Amino acid sequence: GPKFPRVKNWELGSITYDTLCAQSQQDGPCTPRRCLGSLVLPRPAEQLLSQARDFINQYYSSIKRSGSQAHEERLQEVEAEVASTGTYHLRESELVFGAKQAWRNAPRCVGRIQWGKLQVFDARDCSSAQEMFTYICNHIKYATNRGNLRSAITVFPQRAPGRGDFRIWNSQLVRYAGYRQQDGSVRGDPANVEITELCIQHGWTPGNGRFDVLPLLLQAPDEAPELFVLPPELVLEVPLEHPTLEWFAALGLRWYALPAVSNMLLEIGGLEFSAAPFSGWYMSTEIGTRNLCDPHRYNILEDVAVCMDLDTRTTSSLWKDKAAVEINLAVLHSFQLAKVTIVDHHAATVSFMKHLDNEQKARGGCPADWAWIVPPISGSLTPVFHQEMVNYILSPAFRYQPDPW
Amino acid sequence: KFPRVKNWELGSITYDTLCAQSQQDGPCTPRRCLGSLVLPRKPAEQLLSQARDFINQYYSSIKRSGSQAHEERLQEVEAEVASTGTYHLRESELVFGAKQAWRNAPRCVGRIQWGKLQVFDARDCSSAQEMFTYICNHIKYATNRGNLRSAITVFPQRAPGRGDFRIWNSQLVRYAGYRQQDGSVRGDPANVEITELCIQHGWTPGNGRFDVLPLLLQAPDEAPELFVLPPELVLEVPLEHPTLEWFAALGLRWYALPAVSNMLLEIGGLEFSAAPFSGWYMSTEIGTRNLCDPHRYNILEDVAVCMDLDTRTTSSLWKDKAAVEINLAVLHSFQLAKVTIVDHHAATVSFMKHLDNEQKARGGCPADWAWIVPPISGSLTPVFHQEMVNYILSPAFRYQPDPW
Numbered sequence: 001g002p003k004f005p006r007v008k009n010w011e012l013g014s015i016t017y018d019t020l021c022a023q024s025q026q027d028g029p030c031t032p033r034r035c036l037g038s039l040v041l042p043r044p045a046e047q048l049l050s051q052a053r054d055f056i057n058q059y060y061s062s063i064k065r066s067g068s069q070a071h072e073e074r075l076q077e078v079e080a081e082v083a084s085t086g087t088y089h090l091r092e093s094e095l096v097f098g099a100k101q102a103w104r105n106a107p108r109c110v111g112r113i114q115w116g117k118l119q120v121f122d123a124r125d126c127s128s129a130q131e132m133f134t135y136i137c138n139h140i141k142y143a144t145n146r147g148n149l150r151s152a153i154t155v156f157p158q159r160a161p162g163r164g165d166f167r168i169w170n171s172q173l174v175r176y177a178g179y180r181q182q183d184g185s186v187r188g189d190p191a192n193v194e195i196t197e198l199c200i201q202h203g204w205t206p207g208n209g210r211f212d213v214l215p216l217l218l219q220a221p222d223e224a225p226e227l228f229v230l231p232p233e234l235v236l237e238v239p240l241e242h243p244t245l246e247w248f249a250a251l252g253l254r255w256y257a258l259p260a261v262s263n264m265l266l267e268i269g270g271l272e273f274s275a276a277p278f279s280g281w282y283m284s285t286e287i288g289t290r291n292l293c294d295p296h297r298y299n300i301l302e303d304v305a306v307c308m309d310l311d312t313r314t315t316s317s318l319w320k321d322k323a324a325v326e327i328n329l330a331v332l333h334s335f336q337l338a339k340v341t342i343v344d345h346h347a348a349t350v351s352f353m354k355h356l357d358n359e360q361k362a363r364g365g366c367p368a369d370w371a372w373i374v375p376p377i378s379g380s381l382t383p384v385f386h387q388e389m390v391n392y393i394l395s396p397a398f399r400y401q402p403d404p405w
Numbered sequence: 406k407f408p409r410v411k412n413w414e415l416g417s418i419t420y421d422t423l424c425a426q427s428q429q430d431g432p433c434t435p436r437r438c439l440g441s442l443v444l445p446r447k448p449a450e451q452l453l454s455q456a457r458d459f460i461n462q463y464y465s466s467i468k469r470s471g472s473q474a475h476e477e478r479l480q481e482v483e484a485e486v487a488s489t490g491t492y493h494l495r496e497s498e499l500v501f502g503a504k505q506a507w508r509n510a511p512r513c514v515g516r517i518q519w520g521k522l523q524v525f526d527a528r529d530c531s532s533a534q535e536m537f538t539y540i541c542n543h544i545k546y547a548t549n550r551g552n553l554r555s556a557i558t559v560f561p562q563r564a565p566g567r568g569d570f571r572i573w574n575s576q577l578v579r580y581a582g583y584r585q586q587d588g589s590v591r592g593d594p595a596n597v598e599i600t601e602l603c604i605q606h607g608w609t610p611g612n613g614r615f616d617v618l619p620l621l622l623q624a625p626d627e628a629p630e631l632f633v634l635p636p637e638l639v640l641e642v643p644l645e646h647p648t649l650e651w652f653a654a655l656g657l658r659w660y661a662l663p664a665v666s667n668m669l670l671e672i673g674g675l676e677f678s679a680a681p682f683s684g685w686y687m688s689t690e691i692g693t694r695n696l697c698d699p700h701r702y703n704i705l706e707d708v709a710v711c712m713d714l715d716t717r718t719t720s721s722l723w724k725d726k727a728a729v730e731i732n733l734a735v736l737h738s739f740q741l742a743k744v745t746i747v748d749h750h751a752a753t754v755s756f757m758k759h760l761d762n763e764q765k766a767r768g769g770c771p772a773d774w775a776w777i778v779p780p781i782s783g784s785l786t787p788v789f790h791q792e793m794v795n796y797i798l799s800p801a802f803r804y805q806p807d808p809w
């Protein structure tokens with residue numbers, strides 16, 4: 001056969017070869033001697049220019065003007081810019097293309113069937129924390145759209161050599177506070193204890209609920225981060241109820257509509273956008289299974305199973321499984337009731353399979369992180385479980401970056 | 406560099422140093438990870454070094470390393486490879502090698518049990534008939550009236566001058582799959598090809614959904630021979646649900662003994678092409694994969710309809726709900742039948758314990774996260790939150806191509 005990874009779908013028996021991986025200009029953490037594909041985290045003008053040239057080539061390919069005069073002119077314009085400044089700047093349409101391509105290229109995102117439909121907000125003119133806040137508020141308003149969620153990304157100015165970064169300190173635009181208690185337990189989201197304490201140290205009067213929306217800690221270059229409280233009316237939340245378990249509503253659970261990652265680095269052509277929050281809509285298991293049922297998160301599995309009167313004293317009763325299913329159903333039912341976009345893990349994974357087929361034809365493959373694409377409940381009940389996947393890093397890319405503090 | 410391995414639920418970090426012991430390459434490269442792939446895409450000195458390495462492991466295990474009998478045994482192996490191009494394991498070494506292959510098996514969640522393995526030396530087997538007798542004893546021993554006991558039976562090693570001893574079945578016990586005229590399959594669609602091979606080799610087919618296949622056993626360079634397992638040897642569990650009284654009427658059942666019969670056991674450079682092993686089931690293998698996979702018995706919709714769920718839409722999570730009840734039925738029924746089974750919560754918890762032991766014992770543990778994390782309720786189990794390093798240690802079980 002061909003010398004490219006052979007990729008099998010075990011449910012269907014179909015075979016594809018990934019040739020796209022040939023485009024990867026960046027090494028992952030795996031070697032022939034060991035696979036580290038389950039690790040969450042991994043671990044100069046000449047370099048910039050090659051990355052720039054490569055991106056400009058991608059861009060001109062995408063507009064079908066590869067090799068053209070404008071392509072060569074743009075390439076030269078970029079070299080000369082890097083020549084005199086040590087950096088360069090993207091044209092608006094390049095930024096739009098690059099942002100979309102970074103999403104398209106994101107191995108961990110199951111939502112990529114939507115990749116061509118991304119509203120890119122250019123906020124590269126932003127010059128203060130206050131303006132960052134306005135742009136973020138605007139983003140949230142646009143993306144939330146009163147429950148009819150729209151994918152969006154707001155791109156703040158790129159890392160500039162000699163100058164400090166724009167950084168959103170929160171990992172998400174909307175996340176709930178986590179308050180460490182005397183007993184050592186946490187009220188709210190344990191994931192967010194550190195950022196919550198930073199909000200308080202920076203002047204935020206903290207609530208004491210399990211679902212207090214965190215304020216934004218926004219950092220303009222070479223300034224201390226500034227604190228901005230999101231106006232409650234901008235943050236759409238959904239009270240959780242269950243379609244058949246009437247008591248479920250009395251748990252007082254809720255989640256926010258808008259999943260917006262705010263601390264990833266968007267890298268395009270060697271340029272680094274350290275603040276480029278993007279948002280899509282939730283896949284229900286992100287909330288139902290991970291946020292609400294993770295032992296290190298809200299960890300509500302036992303609470304719900306007890307209310308369901310399950311035998312929580314034995315693993316074989318599958319109480320964790322029964323309760324998790326009902327929480328997930330409650331999440332779906334409540335978002336649907338509240339008319340807030342949400343996709344269940346079956347619809348999401350079916351759409352990702354369609355995406356894989358599209359991308360096979362468009363690009364000869366699709367980088368995908370199986371561990372992340374397969375949902376955290378009902379894994380093999382979704383088609384992606386049976387789909388071998390090849391993981392590799394393509395640029396443009398979203399990258400994790402260390403917390404600014 | 407040693408991979409830093411974090412558990413995201415507990416925040417604890419380990420470093421895998423064991424992976425440095427890997428002498429065999431997996432499918433990954435820095436350019437791309439192929440960790441989700443089920444199968445791999447594809448002389449005296451090398452054998453001698455694998456042999457020496459293994460003998461060294463063996464003598465280190467009985468803490469007689471560098472000793473006398475150690476050096477004699479290394480000498481024996483060297484003299485035998487030098488003159489014959491191969492060598493033979495002492496039974497004690499074979500026993501050690503098999504347990505170690507199990508211990509090293511990245512996809513096995515049952516490895517807490519690795520030290521308790523009954524090893525049957527069937528290397529004195531000269532015919533398919535004798536293989537069948539060994540296999541029958543294996544099954545009897547392993548099944549043990551439902552009190553399942555891990556076992557492996559090791560048939561003669563591969564030899565350069567001849568065909569392999571092979572069991573053609575992928576499992577000792579598996580159900581037939583009969584391709585119907587209308588393209589559908591009665592029974593297990595996973596077994597259509599082996600079912601057809603059995604028929605072509607003269608088996609009279611049943612037409613049930615759960616007809617236990619006969620064994621196609623191949624002695625070297627001979628046509629495979631067909632042997633029917635004595636039904637009394639094949640313990641089966643009718644599946645009923647503890648609360649859904651209609652579930653038993655589905656007529657579903659599964660066999661007690663999960664026994665892989667087509668993997669190659671490699672020990673010290675020697676390859677055992679037939680070395681069927683068995684443990685006991687983790688419920689999700691049956692409830693979720695065997696019964697609910699779309700390309701297997703695919704019973705999700707039937708159960709969901711019997712549960713009277715809204716089957717028309719994904720958002721009702723009928724699949725998830727049905728799957729849970731099926732797994733619950735499997736556990737209840739095996740527990741009712743007094744047949745050893747482990748649920749995926751118990752199994753993954755014990756596996757975490759095993760990871761801890763192995764971290765202390767050997768500085769790591771090869772683990773294939775995609776396989777260790779159960780097919781349902783992944784993140785509800787501790788292994789989901791556990792980063793794992795996957796690599797090939799020897800002794801090893803490896804896949805091998807189907808003999809036909």
Ligand code: HEM
Nearest residue numbers: 103106108109110111114151152278279280281282283398
């Ligand atoms: C449109 C609806 C979308 C859906 C349903 C969706 C779905 C998902 C899901 C379920 C994850 C796993 C997150 C986790 O478990 O932590 C994820 C991750 C990710 N998504 Fe999306 N996504 C969507 C939109 C977007 C957009 C608009 C972008 C960027 C422009 C994007 C880029 C990413 C990236 C970079 C990750 C990795 C995040 C991480 O590793 O923490 N996604 N997506």
Ligand code: HEM
Nearest residue numbers: 507510512513514515518555556557682683684685687802
């Ligand atoms: C004692 C109880 C045992 C349990 C609960 C157990 C559990 C499992 C499970 C859940 C898998 C994944 C199976 C699949 O989905 O295909 C597996 C695979 C495997 N197990 Fe075990 N196992 C046990 C005993 C053994 C023994 C005795 C051996 C060998 C001596 C063994 C070696 C292996 C190997 C090599 C695999 C990979 C098989 C494959 O890729 O198809 N296991 N085990």
Ligand SMILES: Fc1cccc(CCNCCNc2ccnc(-n3ccnc3)n2)c1
Nearest residue numbers: 040109172259260261278279280281400401
């Ligand atoms: F940098 C890191 C260090 C440790 C864990 C980690 C995982 C981050 N995942 C958080 C949840 N992912 C989210 C959250 C909200 N929204 C999305 N989202 C939005 C659109 N597509 C996905 N994804 C990163």
Ligand SMILES: Fc1cccc(CCNCCNc2ccnc(-n3ccnc3)n2)c1
Nearest residue numbers: 443513576663664665682683684685804805
């Ligand atoms: F060579 C291959 C080609 C395609 C799939 C594949 C994996 C199939 N795995 C079969 C199910 N695994 C089983 C079955 C029975 N028994 C166990 N088992 C018993 C003890 N430990 C595991 N595991 C190999």
Ligand SMILES: C[C@H](O)[C@H](O)[C@H]1CNc2nc(N)[nH]c(=O)c2N1
Nearest residue numbers: 038039040371372789790791792
């Ligand atoms: C250890 C493991 O890599 C880790 O728990 C991963 C597994 N898969 C995941 N998949 C998604 N979508 N999101 C996650 O946070 C994780 N966590």
Ligand SMILES: C[C@H](O)[C@H](O)[C@H]1CNc2nc(N)[nH]c(=O)c2N1
Nearest residue numbers: 385386387388441442443775776
């Ligand atoms: C494509 C994917 O690797 C394949 O479906 C794997 C996923 N995880 C698995 N895990 C186990 N335990 N058994 C399996 O057969 C599989 N199949």
Ligand SMILES: OC[C@@H](O)[C@@H](O)[C@H](O)[C@H](O)CO
Nearest residue numbers: 171191192193194195196403
């Ligand atoms: O409270 C601090 C954590 O939420 C923070 O460190 C996040 O885990 C991080 O920003 C995710 O990238």
Ligand SMILES: OC[C@@H](O)[C@@H](O)[C@H](O)[C@H](O)CO
Nearest residue numbers: 575595596597598599667807
């Ligand atoms: O019907 C033949 C299949 O059961 C067989 O090819 C298995 O999939 C394979 O042998 C598993 O190793």
Ligand SMILES: [Zn+2]
Nearest residue numbers: 030035433438
């Ligand atoms: Zn890998």
